[PDB]
Design a protein around this ligand. Structure first.
Ligand SMILES: [Zn+2]
Ligand SMILES: [Zn+2]
Lengths: 656, 82, 163, 325
DNA sequence: ACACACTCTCCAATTCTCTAATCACTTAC
DNA sequence: GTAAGTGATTAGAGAATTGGAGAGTGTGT
């Protein structure tokens, strides 16, 4: 077999520095390569040999840059390039590698794709394909178009999608989090060619519907590595301020190093001995405790817990993150992307979303659902944070009550499939559920922003009716407890749980305001449907269940690296049960006292002024008040009751 | 095999031994709550070290918090609260 | 004032003050010396309301015997002898605390060396792999040590002995 | 999605090394001479050539660019050095063509700092000063021949045929602790790949105290020095030299047993005890200096080159008719 | 002889299903 | 509206599947 591939591959041409030189029978060589790839088996021998020889970087992209290239040569080059740039799981027909030997072939396919990405860091390639796109759409009328050029244009568009869906590469080196990614260089070349304006022009046309889903996928994959907070703030700098700032940063680093080293070298002591702690019992009979280092005081003793190996969970039940390569890019890249986002909102968004929502959930392919929810979340957060209030007309496809309805339906289906299935399939459905939850959170926050800051009372009334519908109907009010009771770390990421906590925080603030203004007094409930009085304390009491409070104590362990918003949300939810329902017995628990011990140890290293200046002072103060309330009436049986989670009758009998 | 379980948690090394350890502990309510917490936490560690020496204090307290859901431990607590 | 970091303690003064403490100092130097240091540092901090770069260290002196008159009873007791210096060695680094790094996820842990022994971690608390750490030698901490050779004085000796 | 089909762990970050990497990258890409010339951006073009591996950097230029950056490097030199090499590697790849990025992926590159004014005497090399940037002077006694040394290695799993890359070597030859395939249980059976591994030129040298250092009634001390890369064989016996670098500690590597190597003492004053690789044996240490830069302390084309002062004075001397007296 | 690697066996955790008891809703006076 | 009876939900126990630790034994230096 592969002698045929080796004969075809080296017969194309050779790249001089700055010029590719071609042999006359490139056309027949490329035909033979396509023929072999069509006839390749499950071993994928011809495909792996093409990946070994690096056809895309060495030959095909420099060939496409040539000016003398005729129509058929360009056409068949694009055909072969699309087939080689197909993703790996698509080559493996959707099945993930279930076996030790299948994973080897998957990895061998994946590395060849990761190597090829730096070929597309040149604007000349995008300039070359932009002319063919312009010929079909702009320079040819709808009556006079050719199906051959139609298929070529479809291949070019799918090639752009396949290029932007390539993963990052670790082998080239490790790069810091505060500089331009390798993805950004492809973005710079893509935007400098100006092909994005043609893509926006195509997306604006109602007649050209079949390209719209792919164009949505392309713009989502461009914005893959960014967050709305990076682009929302307008970029400006002065180098005087930058120099002063960097000098202060290294001043912090130097002082930290000197203090830490002097503390460590002052810790050591010279000689030894061995000592008995009279009053503490040993394991063996009639024995006192014995130590073999000069301890300062008896409370410094640790019972040699440093030796003992920690118990691990089994491999099916450990928490897992999902990693997006996320960085603070340069001011140049951020300015270009900000301009692109504003142009998309002005020219494409309403038509594109309206064309997409009829089709995205009907299709066989899974990934466009994730792209749909991602683009919704990004655009709405960008509008709200940038305060570009005149753009609110342009996103009117997403403001209705129907948006909340359709989002809730899709989120419910994803949660049920992710809970009931097993394995990588369950993780795959849970990944969809995560993006749906984030889009729901942005819907809530955007409607509150419109109701607070819009200038037109008609727009305020339209937002207010939607907010009242969300507060009133049971499906929206029962959703957080429904998801929290089904959470499991085997099939859902930590990012999902953080997102769920923040969503619950914002929703409960909305319900509290609509009760406080008196707008919520009576509530419909299913039986037939009947109306009953609503009480906010009765609603808050649902979250005091043990199956909810487990995860709040679980996420409070990461306090030293959480964001300030997440720390505020966790402390606020505990503070409500502590001092609004006024029920501290449910929070008296050893696994929370461990978190308080860690926080106290962290705060020992700071002076009395720096403690009040610190960002963790809210958590410190809450721990102070709860521990004082605990020790106000300490008893030994209460200290025994702290070891177990306490139910309702347990709380009543402990209290009374 | 060997593992911490309900027999050990209800046995003579268990909850009654922890109660006997805690009989001498009497914190001052007017003092620093974090200092009182530190004093309590090391008595928990001392009882855990005597009760099951193989494992860390953190994992011992996690295992006790898990084993509180068993019916045998619940029946023990129902008798012990009297 | 001059930021000197040691005190020479003349033991005759301590013996004049209290023999009951002098006996304890000579009999148990490997156990009581780590606490008389702390009393000196406490008195310094109370008197001057100030900290220093290293702890003030004790050096007891002027406790005399011969090199041949030592017995197994004298092990770990305080002694004083005299002689001439013939040779000194180059410096040896002696570790006090090592530094481990996980091979899989670049997490890093310190570990004190004591009783002549270090304790190696087994399970990585970050990534939960086992038998996974590697010691990084140049990230760890050392102290100076020197060997000096001392020779008998020939004056005191009985008949026929070589120094 | 496919991040979970892959099995790779997230790496923990050294924030100090990360900030040093970012600022050193800016220093390489932005520094201007008084002639308004980018010296280091010019010099990074030369590293494509096969004979060259190092950039020689003046410390005063670092101090001019940023005071606290040079202060951080001098305090934490051993810890921050791989980040500086990484910044140099990425900044070189930004300059290379597609023809040359093929070659540059393997190649090792070095930073060579010089022109410190903080001299220390040889007897002052306490164990406190491990890892800091230091200058010293000495006389060279021996110059051992050249060897290639392994730096980053690639290993093939014998069970499943997957290549595990960039296993960073310590003083000792090491195999990976775990196969890169997440559905493979091998931790012992590996084979090194030569044509993917990276090799480093190495040289060992001995130095002696200069006579002006010596105390009362004293015999000179000697030090072992390690040299790498482009500085190999740049100096001869009998020379008197200034060295800039750092002080390091090297172990007795013959006491350890791992996959791929058993202990030489088993094949054929008290140390550290406790490690899995040290079953009953114990580990001890020696001092050595890891040199960053070495130099000696002090025909018509050459005559033209020594142009103003030297030709004027030497031509007057040549004209002197009583020059013998 | 001593160290290191590999294989087998057992036990514990989880989830589904069936049975029994207690609580709440519906029906009747 | 109140009391009694019946239905539904919740709690416990038994059985089966999955995975990991530990100990024993064999081989190589
Ligand atoms: Zn790790
Ligand atoms: Zn393998």
């Amino acid at each position: 077999m592969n002698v045929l591939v080796q004969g075809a591959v080296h017969a194309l041409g050779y790249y001089e520095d700055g010029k590719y030189s071609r042999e006359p029978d490139c056309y027949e060589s490329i035909r033979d390569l396509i023929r072999y790839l069509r006839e390749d088996g499950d071993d994928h021998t011809a495909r792996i040999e093409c990946g070994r020889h690096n056809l895309v970087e060495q030959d095909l992209v420099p060939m496409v840059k040539c000016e003398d290239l005729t129509d058929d040569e360009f056409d068949i080059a694009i055909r072969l390039m699309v087939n080689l740039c197909q993703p790996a799981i698509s080559t493996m027909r959707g099945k993930p590698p279930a076996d030790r030997d299948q994973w080897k072939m998957y990895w061998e396919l994946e590395e060849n794709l990761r190597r090829a990405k730096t070929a597309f860091s040149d604007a000349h390639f995008f300039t070359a394909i932009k002319k063919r796109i312009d010929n079909y759409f702009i320079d040819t009328e709808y009556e006079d178009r050719d199906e051959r050029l139609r298929l070529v244009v479809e291949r070019i568009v799918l090639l752009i999608k396949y290029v932007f869906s390539i993963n990052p590469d670790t082998s080239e080196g490790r790069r810091t989090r505060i500089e331009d990614s390798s993805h950004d260089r492809v973005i710079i070349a893509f935007l400098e060619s100006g092909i994005d304006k043609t893509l926006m022009h195509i997306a604006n046309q109602p007649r050209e519907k079949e390209f719209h889903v792919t164009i949505l996928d392309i713009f989502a994959l461009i914005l893959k590595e960014q967050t709305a907070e990076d682009l929302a703030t307008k970029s400006e700098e002065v180098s005087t301020a930058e120099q002063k700032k960097t000098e202060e940063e290294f001043r912090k680093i130097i002082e930290n190093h000197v203090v830490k080293e002097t503390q460590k070298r002052k810790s050591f002591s010279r000689f030894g001995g061995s000592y008995t702690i009279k009053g503490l019992k040993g394991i063996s009979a009639n024995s006192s405790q014995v130590v073999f280092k000069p301890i300062q005081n008896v409370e410094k003793h640790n019972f040699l817990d440093d030796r003992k190996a920690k118990k691990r969970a089994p491999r099916n039940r450990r928490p897992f993150e999902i990693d997006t390569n996320s960085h603070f890019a340069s001011s140049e890249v951020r300015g270009m992307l900000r301009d692109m986002v504003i142009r998309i909102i002005e020219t494409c968004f309403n038509r594109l979303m309206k064309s997409s929502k009829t089709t995205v959930f009907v299709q066989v392919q899974k990934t466009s659902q994730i792209n749909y929810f991602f683009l919704i979340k990004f655009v709405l957060r960008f509008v709200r944070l940038s305060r570009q209030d005149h753009l609110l007309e342009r996103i009117s496809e997403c403001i209705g009550v129907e948006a909340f309805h359709e989002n809730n339906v899709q989120l419910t289906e994803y949660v049920e499939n992710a809970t009931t299935l097993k394995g990588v399939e369950a993780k795959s459905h849970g990944l969809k559920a995560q993006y749906a939850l984030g889009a729901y959170n942005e819907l809530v926050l955007l409607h509150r922003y419109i109701y607070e800051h819009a200038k037109e009372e008609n727009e305020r009334k339209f937002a207010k009716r939607a907010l009242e519908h969300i507060v009133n109907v049971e499906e929206y009010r029962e959703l957080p407890i429904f998801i929290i009771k089904k959470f499991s770390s085997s099939v859902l990421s930590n990012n999902f749980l953080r997102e769920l906590v923040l969503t619950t925080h914002h929703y409960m603030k909305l319900v509290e305001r609509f009760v406080k203004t008196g707008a919520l007094k009576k509530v419909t409930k299913k039986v037939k449907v009947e109306e009953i009085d609503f009480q906010f304390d009765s609603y808050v009491c649902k979250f005091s269940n043990v199956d909810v409070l487990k995860w709040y104590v679980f996420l409070l362990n990461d306090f030293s690296k959480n964001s300030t918003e997440l720390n505020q949300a966790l402390v606020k939810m505990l503070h409500r049960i502590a001092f609004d329902l006024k029920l501290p017995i449910k929070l008296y628990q050893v696994s929370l006292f461990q978190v308080f011990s860690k926080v106290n140890e962290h705060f020992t290293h700071l002076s009395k002024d720096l403690r009040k200046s610190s960002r963790l002072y809210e958590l410190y103060q809450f721990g102070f008040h709860l521990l004082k309330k605990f020790f106000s009436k300490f008893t030994g049986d209460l200290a025994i009751e702290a070891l177990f989670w306490k139910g309702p009758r347990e709380c009543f009998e402990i209290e009374n | 095999r060997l593992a911490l379980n309900e027999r050990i948690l209800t046995g003579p090394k268990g909850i009654s031994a922890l109660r006997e350890t805690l009989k001498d502990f009497k914190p001052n309510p007017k003092d620093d709550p974090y200092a009182n917490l530190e004093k309590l936490m090391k008595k928990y560690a001392y009882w855990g070290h005597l009760m099951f020496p193989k494992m860390k204090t953190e994992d011992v307290l996690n295992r006790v918090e898990t084993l509180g859901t068993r019916r045998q431990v619940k029946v023990f607590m129902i008798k012990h609260r009297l | 004032d001059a930021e000197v970091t040691h005190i020479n303690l003349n033991l005759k003064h301590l013996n004049a003050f209290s023999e009951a403490l002098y006996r304890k100092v000579i009999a148990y130097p490997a156990d009581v010396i780590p606490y008389l240091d702390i009393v000196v540092n406490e008195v310094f901090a109370e008197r001057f309301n100030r900290t220093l770069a290293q702890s003030i260290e004790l050096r007891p002196f002027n406790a005399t015997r011969n090199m041949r008159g030592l017995n197994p009873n004298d092990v770990d007791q305080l002694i004083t002898i005299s002689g001439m210096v013939t040779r000194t060695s180059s410096l040896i680094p002696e570790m006090r605390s090592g530094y481990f790094q996980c091979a899989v996820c670049a997490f890093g842990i310190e570990s004190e060396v004591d009783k002549g022994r270090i304790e190696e971690p087994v399970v990585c608390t970050n990534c939960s792999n086992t038998h996974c750490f590697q010691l990084v030698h140049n990230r760890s901490v050392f102290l100076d040590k020197q060997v000096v050779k001392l020779q008998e004085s020939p004056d005191d000796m009985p008949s026929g002995e070589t120094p | 999605m496919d991040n979970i089909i892959g099995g790779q762990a997230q790496q923990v970050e050294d924030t100090d090394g990360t900030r040093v990497q970012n600022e050193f990258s800016k220093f390489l890409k932005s520094f201007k001479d008084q002639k308004n010339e980018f010296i280091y951006k010019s010099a990074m073009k030369e590293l494509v050539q096969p004979e060259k591996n190092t950039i020689f950097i003046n410390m005063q230029h670092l101090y001019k660019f940023s005071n606290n950056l040079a202060t951080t490097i001098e305090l934490q030199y051993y810890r921050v050095y791989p980040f500086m090499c990484e910044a140099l590697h990425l900044a070189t790849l930004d300059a290379c063509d597609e023809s040359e990025r093929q070659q540059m992926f393997k190649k090792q590159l070095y930073v060579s700092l010089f022109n410190l004014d903080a001299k220390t005497k040889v007897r002052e090399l306490s164990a406190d000063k491990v890892g800091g940037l230091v200058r010293i002077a000495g006389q060279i006694v021996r110059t051992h021949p050249v060897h290639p040394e392994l730096s980053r290695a690639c290993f093939v799993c014998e069970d499943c045929g997957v290549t595990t890359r960039d296993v960073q070597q310590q003083f000792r030859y090491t195999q990976p602790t775990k196969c890169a395939n997440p559905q493979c249980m091998n931790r012992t059976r590996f084979s090194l790949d030569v044509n993917s591994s990276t090799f480093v030129d190495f040289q060992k040298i001995r130095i002696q105290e200069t006579q002006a250092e010596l105390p009362r009634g004293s015999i000179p001390r000697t030090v072992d020095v390690i040299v790498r890369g482009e500085m190999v064989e740049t100096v001869q016996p009998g020379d008197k030299c200034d060295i800039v670098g750092t002080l390091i500690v090297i172990p007795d590597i013959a006491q350890l047993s791992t996959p791929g190597l058993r202990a030489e003492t088993s094949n054929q004053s008290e140390g550290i005890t406790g490690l899995k690789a040290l079953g009953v044996r114990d580990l001890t240490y020696k001092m050595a200096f890891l040199a960053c830069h070495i130099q000696q302390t002090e025909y018509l084309d050459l005559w033209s080159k020594m142009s103003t002062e030297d030709r004027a004075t030497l031509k007057k001397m040549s004209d002197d008719k009583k020059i013998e007296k």
